[PDB]
Design a protein around this ligand. Structure first.
Ligand code: NAP
Ligand code: NAP
Lengths: 658, 658
């Protein structure tokens, strides 16, 4: 089976992150069998030692000699740590000299929570381990590759990282999906810069067969554990959505509404004539869809679900005592029956197996083999190879440019509205949006949330008339956007429409260095992390907070490219646009599937090429008018009757290009 | 170099169309070296005999025996002929038994003309040779593959066939681009049906190095020949656009306007105070951009360009004597200087080489090698593999669903308009569109162009009020849509907005047969040709005629999928949607780059999955209202001041999903 592999990569030096197990282990194994010297990097020394021993044994079996010199390991290497990545490169260059192939394989599953339950530090951790790490290793190794005249960077993405012009929603995995899309976007935008000496591509396998206790989750190993978590999550989502909906149209405070849940009695809530319709209707559903042997059919929640619900409400600025659930009656086991858990487990498994046209999942070996053959191809860069595929799954096309204004019915819903605008750099855009909502669409007030006092003063001067009239209020958020939103909620009221633009512009540093240079001025590992913080994490933090705070709509705006932008700015802008599309699509579907009203969409001020950009003042005025139209199209709320299943799916998770 | 190849496909039987030369020859060669028995099919026996001899010699050199039994040829096989395809399969099965790998490689460059210069029979020929042939061979071979439990269909598409969710415009190659996109779309939609026994994928290489006198044109061999044709085409386009524009706002007939060109004198046209501004401005440009040593700088045209211009005008319903150019002064050679031709030739070459990130084109051998390694992958279906890539080129994302109505400024341009609606099956859509344009937007008249008397009567009864009032006229086109449009032009006037819907619904036959069946009821080769005629060629014929006839706008409407449509109908609909996107994108860019006013876009009534479709009367009314909004968004003409370079590119070549 190895006859076509032996010799294919003879003389090459490869570094494989996550090379002690899974797909990375198989890629390391097959590259070694192909004749490459390999450095396997991971955290656990024992597993690395086992993998090294197995590969060295197989190398000896096929005739290699001095096998100890062909397979090295780098234990203690957590790819989320910049220091460990620097040490990894020092160790690898000391052992083998210049690296020919960088296999950015390491990937963690991540937080595995919906965005509104996702800790901000957890999201950052996923980006560091799965995406920023890929740039860091490229930044350290590409200089030597360019000097020698040849190199290869392979980022191991996923089918769920999307594809060119199509986002793939991955509910409960936004952090992971964004990391995977960024890996592909990096290959797509860096190819022109790294050529002709260096190839950069991504692989995007679908679900792969592997250890049930490991993996990135495309294949769920423990379907039953996954099933129970889905059921606990569903109870939380149903209770949270009904409470948020009820509070929007009830005179009772969220505190008073949560008090209705304290008896923890489904039938009592359903039969309470003074209970909000949303909560009575939910109670009926719990009884109808429930298993009489499960306590979840007679009890609303348990301590675990209650704590997670309380966190959602507190994180949305709702005022409730921390001990509100201290005396919650504890429902008797089982809360969910083995029958309910087993049925959901079958649903999860059949859902995944049913995506496969070939009705079989590839093995890690199969994926590694296709990948090692692919690496021999010297005529591909900026591409995403699917070693496994044939999947029935939902895609959300991105990049549409032909659109108009929303219906007068949606526009009428803006009258008397409280609008939140977030930004700093795009002063003209923020001014025009504030005036549009206030002067043309009758919003009661606009809260301008900026990063700095200088930004606040700039906007206050641009909107002096509305400031003097009490219609434009300014808040300075700094690096505390959640606390700034809490200030807005308490003093000005919860938001209806929200527009989120980036505080910062894109950097203008080089993305690659001259062949015989030290690359001292090239985008740094820290600068790349900063780009992700200002252009991805910024939007995530706002989306998470606004969704938890019951905002009506949210437009995520990407950085602006102009006919004057640097070629590097165009590259970074397109990187952000593609990567954020993964976030927008994922949170749009999460929100739709969980009965959240919030409409989340993306408005792109970035374009693929300068030739498409406005070249004169007429074209510029056309562009700024399209920007306002695009924002209005995604932010004007749907008259509640129109939020059909059909229309609701259309108005969520989409991206349009101005 | 063949060590990793020998043994990879041992035991397999492969059929390679276009296997005497080019990429197909290399695929046949490497599959044979890999251990497969191969049938090479093409037209010329001599070239097939040479290729067979070369491969047999190489097989003997590497140790194969009885090489005459491992490489067969099928001369006289024009893939555009169904009869020859049937004979090819009989010959192949007689020689080797069941085919494991069908390599649909054969591809012709096609007409190589803009749509408005493209003979309808030339387009049909390209579809037969490059696309329908692929279905025909699959229809004959897939039954045996499914019976044996294994098979592989590989369609050799092109990067210019687009990708999932993105059309790639290929100006002057619409027939080719559509054929290439169809090859990929076939793999994408048939994968679920052919699995799990059969894999179907496409390869989409970018430009490949090869014989300058051959190839599909991604790499132009004779840059200079290509350059001269570009210059002759540019003269035709500039003259045609100015004449069409002038006739729209001048009292003179096209006959009288063409008379201004008969002295064949650029300076005289520029200096004529009574000449239309468009023609005087063109004459100035010919002088400014011209080479004084070229007769093209002092003369407007030559007999060749004049004949091609006259054909355009006649094909657009303009009335002119056939001998109008009989006494045209013949400009002295050179019409275009070697300097002008050489500069354009450098532009063509640098344009192609500049698309490459790796600054080198792959060889046919390189592409074949990557392809033969790819064929070993058993975990991919419905995918498009890029054996070569890394290209800077324009893409037009498709599949956007979030849009609204056009501006009141565009809508005002419909008042007093002459609208052409084309269709038969979608009676409700045609009725609602006619009433929208007539009752809400003030169109003067709607010409309803249907296929049959039964369709005409159905529409006349649905629109009885407008018929009685002289605002709805009906024409029966049958299979003569061009002649029907000519009738509309002569009796009712040239069209402003035009909506083109398919006359026919999609078929409901099976797309694959049961394993132990004869597949007698499965979509036939003839039925697949008929699908292309009714769902692709229909739109091409209308777009070509409407563009030549100076229509203002044109909406190409794809077939309708409903929550009730068969799974097979969803597959065929998505096949058409993807394939037509290639046409819409290509003709939109051709029109924009050639100064044609016509706005051509696509409105999709097809969706990827039934779950996205309306499920109740409320959702259905939302859908039909979105349909009218989508059509209005692409058909309301641009106030001429607004047709900036920026806005013009946005409003052409786009597709939206209702
Ligand atoms: N599994 C799938 O179905 C699938 C599908 C598509 C894409 N992918 C992608 O394929 C790649 C590998 O996935 P997999 O399923 O093989 O994962 P896996 O089985 O969890 O891979 C584990 C390997 O990664 C190492 N690792 C884990 N966390 C690490 C960290 N923070 N730093 C460094 N090394 C770390 C492990 O050793 P230590 O634990 O000792 O560190 C071990 O070597 C990922 O990028 C993933 O997104 C997987
Ligand atoms: N060339 C490129 O840069 C490029 C790039 C992307 C994709 N492609 C695709 O690759 C495939 C092969 O292209 P190529 O450049 O190799 O073409 P090519 O050099 O013209 O290939 C010629 C081969 O096709 C045969 N052939 C030509 N017309 C035929 C017909 N009507 N029926 C049957 N066989 C016919 C020729 O023999 P006879 O003339 O005797 O029939 C010969 O065997 C096509 O599908 C093409 O679209 C090519």
């Amino acid at each position: 089976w190895a006859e076509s592999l032996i010799g294919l990569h003879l003389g090459k030096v490869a570094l494989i992150t996550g090379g002690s197990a899974g797909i990375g282990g198989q890629i390391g194994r097959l590259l070694a069998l192909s004749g490459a010297r390999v450095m396997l990097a991971a955290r656990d020394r024992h597993k690395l030692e086992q993998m090294q021993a197995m590969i060295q044994s197989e190398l000896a079996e096929v005739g290699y000699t001095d096998v100890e010199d062909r397979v090295h390991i780098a234990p203690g290497c957590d790819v989320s740590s910049e220091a460990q990545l620097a040490d990894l490169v020092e160790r690898t260059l000391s052992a083998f000299g210049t690296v020919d192939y960088l296999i950015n394989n390491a990937g963690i599953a991540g937080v595995e929570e919906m965005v509104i339950d996702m800790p901000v530090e957890g999201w950052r951790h996923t980006l560091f381990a799965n995406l920023i790490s890929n740039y860091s290793l490229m930044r350290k190794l590409a200089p030597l590759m360019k000097k020698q005249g040849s190199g290869y960077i392979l980022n191991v993405s996923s089918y769920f990282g999307g594809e060119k012009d199509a986002a793939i929603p991955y509910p409960n995995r936004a952090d992971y999906a964004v990391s995977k899309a960024g890996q592909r976007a990096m290959a797509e935008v860096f190819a022109r810069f790294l050529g002709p000496e260096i190839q950069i591509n991504a692989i995007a396998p679908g679900p792969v067969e592997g250890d049930r206790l490991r993996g990135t989750g495309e294949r769920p190993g423990l379907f039953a554990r996954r099933a129970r978590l889905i059921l606990e999550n569903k109870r939380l989502n149903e209770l949270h959505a009904a409470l948020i909906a009820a509070a929007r149209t009830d005179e009772r405070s969220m505190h008073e509404l949560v008090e209705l849940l304290l008896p923890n009695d489904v039938a009592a809530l359903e039969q309470n004539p003074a209970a909000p319709t949303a909560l009575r209707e939910l109670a009926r559903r719990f009884r109808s869809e429930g298993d009489p042997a499960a306590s979840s059919s007679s009890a609303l929640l348990n301590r675990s679900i209650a704590a997670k619900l309380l966190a959602r409400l507190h994180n949305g600025g709702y005022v409730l005592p921390a001990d509100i659930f201290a005396n919650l009656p504890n429902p008797p086991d089982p809360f969910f029956t083995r029958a309910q858990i087993d049925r959901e487990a079958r649903k999860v498994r059949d859902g995944i197996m049913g995506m496969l046209y070939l009705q079989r999942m590839p093995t890690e070996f199969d994926v590694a083999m296709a990948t090692v053959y692919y690496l021999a191809d010297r005529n591909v860069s900026g591409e995403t190879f699917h070693p496994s595929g044939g999947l029935r799954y939902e895609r959300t096309p991105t990049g549409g440019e032909l659109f108009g204004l929303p219906s007068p019915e949606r526009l009428a819903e803006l009258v008397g509205s409280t609008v939140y605008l977030i930004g700093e750099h795009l002063t003209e855009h923020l001014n025009l949006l504030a005036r549009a909502y206030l002067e043309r669409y009758g919003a009661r007030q606009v809260v301008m949330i900026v990063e700095t006092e200088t930004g606040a003063e700039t906007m206050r001067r641009l909107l002096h008339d509305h400031v003097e009239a009490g219609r434009l209020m300014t808040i300075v958020a700094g690096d505390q956007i959640e606390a700034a939103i809490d200030q807005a909620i308490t003093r000005y009221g919860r938001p209806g429409p929200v527009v989120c633009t980036p505080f910062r512009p894109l950097p203008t540093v080089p993305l690659v260095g001259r062949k015989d240079s030290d690359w001292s001025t090239v985008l740094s590992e820290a600068e790349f992390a900063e780009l992700c913080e200002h252009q991805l994490t910024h939007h995530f933090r706002v989306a998470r907070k606004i969704a938890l705070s019951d905002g009506a709509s949210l437009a995520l705006v990407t950085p602006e490219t102009t006919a004057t932008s640097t070629t590097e700015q165009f590259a970074l802008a397109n990187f952000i646009k593609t990567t954020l599309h993964a976030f927008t699509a994922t949170i749009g579907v999460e929100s739709e599937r969980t009965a959240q009203r919030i409409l989340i969409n993306q408005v792109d001020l970035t374009r693929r090429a300068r030739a498409e950009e406005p070249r004169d003042p007429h074209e510029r005025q056309q562009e700024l008018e399209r920007f306002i139209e695009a924002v209005l199209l995604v932010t004007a709320p749907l008259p509640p009757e129109a939020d059909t299943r059909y229309a609701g799916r259309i108005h969520r998770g989409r991206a349009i290009t101005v």
